[PDB]
């Protein structure tokens, strides 16, 4: 009645030995946690990274949020940590006429869903979201020519130090060289009561991992990957405005929506309260949303394992159908790993090899097709040197790398090989096939992976 909390997501407590390697652990829990989309991880009791900061010297620019269900918000767009904390505590305290730890979590949750559904309530809140920088940096220890205490050095190279997470060797998004500040650097989040994150999935259907450093809990709702399209169909009917096409990746539209509405339409939803010192992990294509119980501080990062490689290819294909912008070229990343095959982890090498074989075979067929459309001329082209905005398919907006079609008529414009008929009105013999690699260059790159994998 009014609000029925979804069932709880899985909670794990690895031993020190299980904990030691994050990637092995995540691969272990995967068959369970991927059925629920999110899961929670409780570190061994003595794993306690030192959080230390001065609340007066950390400044950030606040974002403002209106709290209305089904209302469109844009995905991305002055306080000290002390002044924000004072505003946030006074707010919660005045809203309930109680001291902040006496407000039960069950009640804030019930109340959140009441106020977002009521339109005569126009509550607005503020929050912080930014990637680490000089005015505001990681909550985890990092190196800087500042002297560190022995406990800080202990955690400098932890797998679960979220700064290290991308650039480890069982990851695949670290090898990328056309790097993407938005996607491999950690984000910092300063919460207050009711500040919230709308329903969404990660760029390129990656994993994410979130650590609550300190403060009051963060409440999560999560949907398994297999149900992504059920949820999207429910969202199209109750709010189709969120689905009209958008001109940038900085223009994505997202919304707040009651999980009971989704459960009514047969979408499986799970929940959890994440407390200080706990991790939440989201799996590929797993929708999630939530809100903060009070003043808190969190840090999160995207990441990609070898498990994800096939999904990452299917995702880029799905972006093409939707005419959605890519953050990076998936094929470019594969070929970069192939070119460094000798220094690759061997399980990585083996899984990259399988994806490369699919890539090569799809590319063969696409080139045959455009040759039969009458495109004859061709020239090698180093796509990775072009700024991303200079190599998107005019039609579907995919980031080109393996190949593209150009014409002297439209200088600078490209189409991917799926959209040869969308470039211009000249006859095909006026077109050129631009390609990064011949098929003969590609088969030896794949062979290097086979050898490294043995």
Ligand X SMILES: O=C(Nc1cccnc1)c1ccc(Cl)cc1Cl
**Does the annotation place 354 within a ligand binding site?**
no
**Does the annotation place 288 within a ligand binding site?**
yes
**Does the annotation place 429 within a ligand binding site?**
no
**Nearer Cβ to Zn ion, position 354 or 419?**
419
Minimum Å distance from CB 416 to ligand X?
A: 30
CB atoms within 10 A of CB 385: 9
For tokens 């652990």, name the residue: 25
- Binding residues for ligand X, rule CB under 6 A, total 10
Residue closest to 325 by CA, chosen among 249, 409, 395: 249
Residues 397-426 interacting with Zn ion (rule: CB under 5 A): 407, 409, 416, 418-419, 424, 426
425-445 b/e with 16+ CB inside 10 Å = b?
A: eeebeebbbbbbbeeeebeeb
| CB-based contact 215:276 (threshold 8 Å) | yes
77 binds, among ligand X, Zn ion, none (CB under 5 to 8 A by kind): ligand X
**Does the annotation place 71 within a ligand binding site?**
no
Minimum Å distance from CB 108 to ligand X?
A: 17
**Nearer Cβ to Zn ion, position 194 or 319?**
319
Interface with ligand X, residue 279, by CB under 6 A: no
Residue closest to 431 by CA, chosen among 393, 378, 381: 378
| CB-based contact 209:29 (threshold 8 Å) | no
Binder of Zn ion out of 30, 42, 354, 395 (CB under 5 A): 395
Structure tokens at 243: 């689905």
**Does the annotation place 418 within a ligand binding site?**
no
Minimum Å distance from CB 76 to ligand X?
A: 4
Minimum Å distance from CB 234 to ligand X?
A: 20
**Nearer Cβ to ligand X, position 34 or 130?**
130
Binder of ligand X out of 79, 189, 221, 437 (CB under 6 A): 189
**Nearer Cβ to Zn ion, position 72 or 386?**
386
**Nearer Cβ to Zn ion, position 418 or 432?**
418
**Does the annotation place 200 within a ligand binding site?**
yes
Distances (CA, A) of 128 to 142, 255, 425: 21, 18, 49
Minimum Å distance from CB 113 to ligand X?
A: 18
372 binds, among ligand X, Zn ion, none (CB under 5 to 8 A by kind): none
Minimum Å distance from CB 221 to ligand X?
A: 11
318 binds, among ligand X, Zn ion, none (CB under 5 to 8 A by kind): none
Residues 72-91 interacting with ligand X (rule: CB under 6 A): 76-77
For tokens 């006859």, name the residue: 427
User: Which residues here bind ligand X, judged by CB under 6 A?
Assistant: 63, 76-77, 127, 129, 189, 197, 210, 288, 300
Annotated binding site: 127, 200, 202, 208, 210, 218, 288
């Amino acid at each position: 009645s009014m609000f029925l909390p979804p069932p709880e997501c899985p909670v794990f407590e690895p031993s020190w030995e299980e904990f030691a390697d994050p990637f092995a652990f995540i691969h272990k829990i995967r068959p369970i946690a991927e059925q629920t989309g999110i899961c929670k991880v409780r570190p061994p009791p003595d794993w306690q990274p030192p959080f230390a900061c001065d609340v007066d010297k950390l400044h950030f620019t606040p974002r403002i949020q209106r709290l209305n269900e089904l209302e469109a918000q844009t995905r991305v767009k002055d306080y000290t940590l002390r002044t924000f904390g004072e505003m946030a505590d006074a707010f919660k305290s005045d809203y309930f006429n109680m001291p902040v730890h006496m407000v039960p979590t069950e009640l804030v949750e019930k109340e959140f869903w009441r106020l977002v559904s009521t339109i005569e309530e126009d509550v607005t809140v503020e929050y912080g979201a930014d990637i680490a920088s000089k005015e505001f940096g990681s909550g985890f220890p990092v190196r800087d020519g500042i002297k560190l205490s022995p406990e800080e050095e202990e955690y400098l190279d932890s797998g679960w130090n979220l700064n290290n997470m991308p650039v480890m060797e069982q990851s695949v998004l670290a090898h990328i060289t056309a790097d993407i500040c938005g996607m491999k650097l950690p984000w910092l989040y300063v919460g207050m009561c009711f500040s919230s994150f709308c329903w969404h999935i990660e760029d390129h259907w990656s994993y994410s991992i979130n650590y609550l450093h300190w403060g009051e809990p963060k409440t999560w709702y999560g949907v398994p990957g297999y149900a992504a399209e059920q949820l999207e169909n429910v969202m199209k009917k109750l709010a189709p405005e969120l689905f009209v096409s958008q001109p940038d990746l900085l223009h994505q539209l997202v919304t707040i929506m009651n999980p009971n509405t989704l459960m009514t339409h047969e979408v499986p939803v799970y929940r959890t309260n994440q407390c200080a010192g706990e991790f939440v992990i989201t799996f590929p294509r797993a929708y999630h949303s939530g809100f903060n119980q009070g003043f808190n501080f969190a840090e999160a990062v995207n990441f990609c394992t070898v498990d994800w490689l096939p999904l990452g290819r299917q995702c880029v294909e799905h972006y093409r159908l939707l005419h959605r912008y890519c953050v990076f070229s998936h094929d470019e990343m594969i070929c970069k790993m192939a070119s460094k095959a000798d220094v690759l982890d061997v399980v990585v090498a083996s899984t990259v090899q399988k994806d490369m074989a699919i890539m090569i075979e799809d590319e063969k067929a696409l080139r045959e097709t455009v040759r039969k459309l009458g495109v004859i001329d061709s020239e090698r082209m180093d796509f990775e040197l072009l700024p991303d905005d200079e190599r998107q398919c005019v039609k579907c907006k995919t980031t080109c790398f393996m190949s593209a079609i150009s014409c002297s008529c439209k200088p600078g414009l490209l189409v991917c090989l799926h959209h040869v008929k969308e470039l211009c009105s000249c006859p095909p013999y006026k077109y050129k096939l631009r390609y990064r690699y011949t098929l003969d260059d590609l088969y030896p790159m794949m062979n290097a992976l086979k050898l490294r994998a043995e």
